């Protein structure tokens, strides 16, 4: 109950500041004020057009590496096992293959951003 | 007469000593620590700020300011 209570208060405080910030100040809306900023000149296109991602391969590698750490985060419970040798070999093998995967991608220039 | 600003390319062999000194410099961020030392040394220096408008920047008799018309 307590965790729910404090997070609601955190939400409540943030939303109150937003309401104050939008209803206290004097406003003056006109078109030139609300147009998008681009260093004093008009944009030549939408900001909604495609924006190329040069690190796209690192990005999807990160998806796999993020499930690798998910497999590592039970380790504090796993070190309590009687089967210490089995746990240790499994953890060593898991870390080593992930290193080999990173090493391969590194030597394939998979960490280099595209030009 | 001229001098080279970045021609220190007398490539030499590396001992264990120098390789370890290079290793320590990379792994322990030693030149980055020297940067922090410099900014730390300024922290304890007296600032150059004057208390304008109670204090003023020095000027000279030649200073060119607001015009006036004079008399005898």
């Amino acid at each position: 109950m307590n965790l729910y209570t404090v997070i609601f208060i955190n939400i409540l405080l943030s939303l109150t500041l937003i309401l104050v910030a939008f209803w206290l100040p004097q406003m003056n809306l006109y078109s030139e004020k609300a147009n998008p900023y681009e260093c004093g000149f008009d944009p030549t296109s939408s900001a909604r057009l495609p924006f190329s991602m040069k690190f796209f391969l690192v990005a999807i590698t990160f998806l796999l590496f993020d499930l690798e750490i998910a497999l590592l985060l039970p380790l504090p419970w796993a070190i309590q096992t009687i089967k210490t040798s089995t746990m240790m070999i499994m953890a060593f093998i898991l870390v080593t293959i992930l290193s080999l995967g990173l090493a391969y991608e590194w030597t394939q220039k998979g960490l280099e951003w595209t030009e | 007469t001229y001098k080279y600003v970045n021609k220190k390319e007398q490539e030499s062999e590396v001992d264990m000593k120098s390789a370890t000194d290079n290793a320590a410099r990379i792994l322990m961020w030693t030149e980055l620590i020297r940067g922090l030392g410099m900014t730390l040394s300024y922290l304890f220096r007296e600032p150059a700020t004057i208390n304008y408008p109670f204090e003023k920047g020095p000027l000279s008799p030649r200073f060119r300011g607001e015009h006036a018309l004079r008399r005898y």
Binding site: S46, R48, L49, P50, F51, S52, M53, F56, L57, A59, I60, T61, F62, L63, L64, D66, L67, E68, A70, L71, L73, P74, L75, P76, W77, A78, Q80, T81, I82, K83, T86, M87, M90, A91, I93, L94, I97, L98, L100, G101, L102, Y104, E105, Q108, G110 | -
Partner: protein, 172 residues
């Protein structure tokens, strides 16, 4: 508090309805983040802890990549929201109405079958070992390191092979 888990599973249902309508993937990505959070709460509510926090953490990472991919490869001049198209909005409202109807009718016909609005909160936790110590879900997951090592061998291989797979797919 007797309605707590039903409310959460009801929120989860709405999130998947929003995703199913497929607005711009920007809002689809947001829909999965909220559903992931609601899904974490349900796992917690049933006595979970590690599993709920894992799936939220994994989906927080997963949708960040999808955000990056969306801005590069799945964007239009006017990205669609749930309200932008009257047809999508209507099926959002109709879908929510059909949820209330489906739960209402099923409650009437059986009363204790799939829907048991009279008994909500009485059948969440069934048995609990009151004086136990080693019971948290992380202990169960950790059996991959000792008793279920085959599960970890296949999981590790798929991530390892995945690196070689995605490098091959993406090279020109």
């Amino acid at each position: 508090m007797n309605n707590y888990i039903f409310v959460l599973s009801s929120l989860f249902l709405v999130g998947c309805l929003g995703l199913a309508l497929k607005p711009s993937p920007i809002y689809g990505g947001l829909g999965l983040i909220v559903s992931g959070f609601v899904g974490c709460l349900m796992v917690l509510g049933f006595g979970g802890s590690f599993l709920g926090l894992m799936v939220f953490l994994i989906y927080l990472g997963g949708m960040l990549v999808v955000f990056g991919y969306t801005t590069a490869m799945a964007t239009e001049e006017y990205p669609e929201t749930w309200g932008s198209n009257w047809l999508i909005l209507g099926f959002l409202v109709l879908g929510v109405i059909m949820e209330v109807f489906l739960i209402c009718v099923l409650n009437y016909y059986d009363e204790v079958g799939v829907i048991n609005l009279d008994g909500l909160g009485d059948w969440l936790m069934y048995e609990v070992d009151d004086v136990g110590v080693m019971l948290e879900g992380g202990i169960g997951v950790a059996a991959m390191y000792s008793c279920a090592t085959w599960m970890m061998v296949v999981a590790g291989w798929s991530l390892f092979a995945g690196i070689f797979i995605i490098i091959e797919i993406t090279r020109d």
